[PDB]
Amino acid sequence: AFQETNPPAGPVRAIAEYERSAAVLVRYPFGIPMELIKELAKNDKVITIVASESQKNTVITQYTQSGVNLSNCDFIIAKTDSYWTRDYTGWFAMYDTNKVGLVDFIYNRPRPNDDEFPKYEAQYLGIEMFGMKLKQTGGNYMTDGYGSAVQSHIAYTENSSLSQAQVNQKMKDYLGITHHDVVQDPNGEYINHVDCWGKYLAPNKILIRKVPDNHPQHQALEDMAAYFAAQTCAWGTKYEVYRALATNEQPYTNSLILNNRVFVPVNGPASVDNDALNVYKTAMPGYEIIGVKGASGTPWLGTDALHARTHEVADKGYLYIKHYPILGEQDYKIEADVVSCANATISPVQCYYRINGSGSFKAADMTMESTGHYTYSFTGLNKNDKVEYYISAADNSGRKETYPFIGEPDPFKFTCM
Ligand SMILES: NC(=[NH2+])NCCC[C@H](N)C(=O)O
Ligand SMILES: [Cl-]
Ligand code: NA
């Protein structure tokens, strides 16, 4: 059962789903199609939860027979009640400047084995765990990686013995959340999970479910989209609000962002799926958008699909780039904090840039002003010049990261004004 602990030594920063992932967590007996596991294992480590050595051998045989990349397959032996790894597995946070930790909570379901799982996850990953005494579920949580978290109202109503202020304080203490945006769920369904209607695609992008004009939740969802469209994101610009039209409860927001690939559940008709996949492609240049059909025995549902049955795993040796970009009409100095959770040697730290969209991107070394603090000034440009840039860093543990994560295909853009 859940065990409360003191929060992590600060400062704390919750890691977003679109940050670097070292693996993805799935569970057996499966709630996902084998084709999805095969596609995930092609590029990423797939950790499968099984209850015993016998179940591990059964899964190995299924993976082997289906041509799954076994070199990217590992296992955790732990009892579980369900395959909703999104909802009961631990949440990732950076803390004490150079560490990655796991945050446990009271799973809001009568599933004691699922509730106990984060202890096994932290042990497997070789990371510390912290017990946040809140009734929570991963399906109802998303962070932008800049201290904001969006959750439906059950984050308050399922913690009714605490004031909203005490609930907010726990999110701040254990996950570094400074903006706990608890909203009235606009879907009118029993589940009240953010992932059934909303998803941050980047710190400045949010996807909000859209339904036909006649649907009873049409105005609630339009109001939610307008609410995000009118607010300033972590980067100081208004959110880019994208909409995925569900003509018949297709769970298009219930996708998985895993490194440079996005796994979107598709239920049909093909024309409606194609429109939703093209919204992701428009919103996320450089990402591989993959439509995934459901398993006939455990199909995708409006309230429960691909995101619900997966959970990304952060990199405990994460080469992290902290940066607030210079954007739009605009001193033209960028600053970035670059820290290695592996305590690896960081070199080089570069700014890749392009002027007026001409030619290839050019690299310039950033200056290290103080430990882990890098700067670069844009100089010798002309008024009305347009700039594209991104940050690039590598370390001697073989890690290579860009900011934004996808790098060159979606650079930061500003105009010399
Ligand atoms: N992240 C999610 N959408 N989770 C769906 C969980 C569905 C499951 N039947 C429950 O209510 O527990
Ligand atoms: Cl403690
Ligand atoms: Na738990």
Author numbering: 44 to 373, 377 to 463
Manuscript text:
Uniquely among microbes to date, P. gingivalis also produces a secreted PAD (called PPAD18), which protects P. gingivalis during acidic cleansing in the mouth through ammonia generated during host and endogenous protein citrullination. PPAD does not require calcium for catalysis and is genetically unrelated with animal PADs and, like the latter and cysteine peptidases, its main catalytic residue is a cysteine (C351 in PPAD20). In contrast, PPAD citrullinates C-terminal arginines like those generated by the prior action of Rgps17, which may be facilitated by the surface co-localization of Rgps and PPAD20.
We further obtained a substrate-mimic complex of DTDP-untreated wt PPAD with dipeptide aspartate-glutamine, and a true substrate complex of DTDP-untreated PPAD–C351A with dipeptide methionine-arginine. The complex structures are equivalent, including the backbone of the bound dipeptides, except for some minimal displacement and the differing side chains, so the substrate complex is taken hereafter as reference except for issues dealing with C351Sγ, for which the substrate-mimic complex will be referred to. Comparison with the substrate-free structure revealed overall coincidence of the complexes except for the rearrangement of the Michaelis loop (maximal displacement 7.5 Å at N230Cα), which adopts a closed conformation that traps the substrate arginine side chain. This causes H196 to be rotated ~100° around its χ1 angle toward bulk solvent and Y233 to be displaced by 4.1 Å and slightly reoriented for its side chain to bind the substrate (see below). The guanidinium group is further tightly bound by D238 through a double salt bridge with arginine Nη1 and Nη2 atoms (2.9 Å and 3.0 Å), by the main-chain carbonyl of T346 (3.2 Å away from atom Nη1), and by D130 through a second double salt bridge with arginine Nε and Nη2 atoms (2.8 Å and 2.9 Å). The aliphatic part of the arginine is bound between the hydrophobic side chains of I234 and W127 (both 3.7 Å apart). The C-terminal carboxylate is linked by a double salt bridge with R152Nη2 (3.0 Å) and Nε (2.8 Å). In addition, one of the carboxylate oxygens is further bound by R154Nη1 (2.9 Å) and the other by Y233Oη (2.8 Å). In addition, these interactions draw an intricate network to fix the substrate in the cleft, which makes it difficult to imagine how a substrate with C-terminal extension to the arginine, i.e. an endodeiminase substrate, would be bound by PPAD, as a C-terminally extended peptide would collide with Y233 and R152 side chains.
